[PDB]
């Protein structure tokens with residue numbers, strides 16, 4: 001076991017191995033807090049996340065396990081992964097805190113688009129990277145579900161990573177989720193990418209809904225109200241009544257709406273912002289789109305190893321989730 005040292009930062013206690021020095025608070029979330037630090041062992045700047053109340057309930061405990069299982073599995077350039085995971089606990093009985101370590105990332109996509117507007121080359125590179133990461137995640141039968149600019153880490157070099165997804169959101173959400181459809185698919189994430197891309201090209205939020213109903217309205221005004229084929233798939237009586245009760249609207253001409261943008265980007269946007277999710281382009285297909293000809297390489301867009309999500313259907317005791325999480329901490333093998 002390594003030697004740990006203790007300190008308090010922004011009301012939070014950090015108990016970390018001596019190898020991590022110069023801890024500096026980067027921010028706090030509802031699920032944990034993060035410090036930037038220097039990893040003396042590798043010479044790298046890292047971000048250290050201390051999970052908040054990881055075993056407070058069955059929900060937290062299961063979430064903590066999910067987070068650790070997912071992060072231990074993600075090994076891809078465009079997906080946040082683990083350099084280290086540790087706990088100051090010396091045994092399972094005293095196990096109460098979990099710390100996660102990854103490469104320090106300087107900013108998020110929201111910071112970038114917010115000041116100022118991006119060149120077409122940057123939009124190509126940034127979206128390409130999202131999609132490359134998404135291909136990988138999707139290949140593991142995982143759906144991100146909450147992709148948005150604040151969840152995309154980007155460094156000075158324009159390198160991008162999808163964050164732990166894992167642990168207003170509304171604006172980037174697929175319309176079928178606004179309708180509370182219980183059987184949405186992986187293309188909910190493609191919808192989000194389309195919204196992000198649009199924003200990077202125009203400098204404006206595409207669908208700034210004030211609530212779920214307004215969100216749906218803004219979406220239908222751009223893409224049109226659903227046609228017959230899509231209406232047939234809506235099992236909910238009330239949702240169908242509502243939708244069909246709306247003044248019918250035509251799909252707008254994307255070339256006109258995003259005029260000035262690279263026509264290839266407009267073409268791709270149209271393939272991503274398809275109302276019927278069964279007809280939306282997938283991440284793998286999007287990577288092959290001509291818009292990314294300068295970046296696409298089918299021999300360098302890997303898929304993920306199989307990911308066992310069976311635990312998701314289990315109803316276990318807090319101590320069981322805790323012990324499973326503890327095993328995962330102890331079995332972690334750092335990357336080379």
Ligand SMILES: CN(C)c1cc(-c2ccncc2)c(-c2ccc3ccccc3c2)nn1
Nearest residue numbers: 034047048049100101102103104105150164
């Ligand atoms: C912006 N946001 C919601 C973030 C931003 C970060 C972050 C900030 C700076 N560099 C890297 C990440 C982490 C975060 C921070 C540390 C992490 C450590 C291990 C695994 C995942 C981690 C995720 N989690 N969420």
Ligand SMILES: Fc1ccc(-c2n[nH]cc2-c2ccncc2)cc1
Nearest residue numbers: 178179180212213216236238239242
């Ligand atoms: F005014 C109304 C009328 C009907 C609905 C409704 N019934 N089922 C689903 C919905 C609905 C409508 C808009 N956005 C999400 C869900 C919501 C508001």
Ligand SMILES: Fc1ccc(-c2n[nH]cc2-c2ccncc2)cc1
Nearest residue numbers: 175176179181226233234275276277
């Ligand atoms: F108004 C809309 C907006 C989106 C959808 C939609 N797109 N893909 C799947 C659906 C959908 C929504 C509700 N129930 C089944 C399927 C359907 C109607």
Ligand SMILES: [Zn+2]
Nearest residue numbers: 056057059060
């Ligand atoms: Zn909670």
